[PDB]
């Protein structure tokens, strides 16, 4: 991913362009995401193929359960910018609902409908390119493993249709963090799954939270152009 970004940035430059991996440079058009397809393996066998939903193993479902349980904390790493939250906005295509499905696009976890069991996996759609690939990937894993170690059932799939299928029970389906401040909060509290195996240390986590917290401050403290459109004649 780092080599990828390097080539993109530099080939663009070499052609008289400028490339950006920002999640949402423009309001009104598509943002840039970084869907993450994942699967586990042992001795060349795909531990995610099974008899359960869409060809999934039960191991895959627990992995999902873990990701859904720790989603908001994972957000602090997969969507590390305030800009990230302008992409993860109640759109219809916007992958903000913490549920899994093979078809539904409101679902932040798509299950690739595929032929060969060798290629069975899950696609966590909410990450964006601003994410530190290492910390984001690791966090996704650690969450999935905590889902497996603790057999966290991901509940039932959401094949029906998105919240634009508004309040049916208010549609109180779990969602991703709605802001960076919130993702940072989640990561603060929900940190144990990361500290497992001494992978993430408290200082490592607190250091990260602090860096991002000062970035969040700049955005929260600086008057926004739109605030003038909305409030200058107040």
């Amino acid at each position: 991913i780092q080599i990828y970004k390097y080539v993109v940035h530099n080939v663009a430059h070499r052609f008289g362009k400028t490339a950006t991996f920002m999640p949402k440079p423009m309001f009104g058009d598509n943002g840039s995401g970084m869907h993450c397809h994942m699967s586990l393996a042992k001795n060349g066998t795909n531990l995610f193929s099974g008899d359960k939903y869409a060809g999934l193993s039960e191991q895959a479902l627990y992995y999902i359960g873990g990701v859904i349980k720790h989603a908001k904390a994972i957000n602090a790493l997969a969507n590390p910018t305030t800009n990230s939250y302008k992409r993860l906005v109640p759109g219809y295509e916007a992958p903000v609902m913490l549920a899994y499905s093979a078809r539904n696009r409101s679902a932040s976890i798509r299950i690739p409908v595929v032929a060969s069991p060798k290629a069975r996996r899950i696609e966590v759609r909410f990450p964006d390119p601003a994410a530190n690939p290492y910390l984001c990937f690791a966090a996704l894993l650690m969450a999935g493993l905590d889902g497996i170690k603790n057999k966290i059932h991901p509940g039932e799939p959401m094949d029906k249709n998105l919240y634009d299928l508004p309040p049916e029970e208010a549609k109180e389906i779990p969602q991703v963090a709605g802001s960076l401040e919130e993702a940072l909060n989640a990561l603060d509290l929900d940190r144990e799954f990361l500290k497992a195996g001494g992978v993430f240390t408290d200082e490592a986590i607190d250091a990260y939270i602090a860096l991002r917290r000062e970035e969040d401050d700049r955005v929260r403290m600086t008057p926004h152009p739109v605030e003038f459109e909305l409030y200058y004649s107040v």
Binding site: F228, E229, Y232, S233
Partner: protein, 234 residues
């Protein structure tokens, strides 16, 4: 009427008389006659034209029609530099003096007559609420190579970003928001009231005035109802 009109000529030292009427499309037309051309004769048989020159009234052969001054409509023009009295006219066919089939005013009068003739009622009451826009600049055109229209006004929400030579003052109605903000957001209070004072000096009765919903100067002056034909005059 005739008797009264000769009075107004001296009371206001009128130098000209502006003969007005409406074409098929609904646009008020006019021709000016010196005050000294007004006499006994003029009121009983009017003055005629080289009419073959108007639209939807154009008959290749029979081009001549009669302008019949309606003495009840006499009113001073508040804009012209030289004292001039406006007199609305009816277009009548020569000799017969009956009232042109294509004359919109004659048509409205016939419809008022017909109401009475059927005995269903004796008077028709009309109260239109016509709305309008006030701009600063309007440009448009169409030729073989293209077409265009460009609207511009100090209130246009799009000007929130415009550089003005004494500075952009910035209080303007947003899209669909020009409704009732008080000045300086509403830049037309003085303009509307002038329109009201003048309308009243011309025989109309004003009920209210206010800015309308659209940005870029939508406004409205509500006038009191009146009998059908008189209202269309108004």
């Amino acid at each position: 009427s005739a008797e009264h009109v000769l009075t107004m000529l001296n009371e206001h030292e009128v130098k000209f008389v502006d003969l007005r009427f409406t074409d098929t499309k609904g646009k008020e037309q006019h021709v000016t006659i010196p005050a000294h051309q007004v006499n006994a004769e003029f009121f009983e048989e009017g003055k005629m034209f080289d009419g073959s020159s108007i639209g939807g009234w154009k008959g290749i052969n029979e081009s001549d029609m009669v302008l019949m001054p309606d003495a009840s409509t006499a009113v001073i023009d508040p804009f012209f530099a030289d004292s001039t009295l406006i007199i609305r006219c009816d277009i009548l066919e020569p000799g017969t003096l009956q009232g042109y089939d294509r004359d919109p005013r004659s048509i409205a009068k016939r419809a008022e007559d017909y109401l009475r003739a059927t005995g269903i009622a004796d008077t028709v009451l009309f109260g239109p609420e016509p709305e309008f826009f006030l701009f600063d600049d309007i440009r448009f055109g169409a030729s073989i190579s293209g077409s265009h229209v460009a609207i511009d006004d100090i209130e246009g929400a799009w000007n929130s970003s415009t550089k003005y030579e004494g500075g952009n003052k910035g209080h303007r109605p947003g899209v669909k928001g020009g409704y009732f903000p008080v000045p300086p957001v509403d830049s037309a209070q003085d303009i509307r009231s002038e329109m009201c004072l003048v309308m009243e000096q011309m025989g109309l009765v004003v009920e209210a005035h206010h800015h309308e919903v659209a940005t870029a100067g939508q406004n409205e002056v509500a006038t009191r109802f009146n009998t059908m034909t008189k209202k269309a005059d108004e």
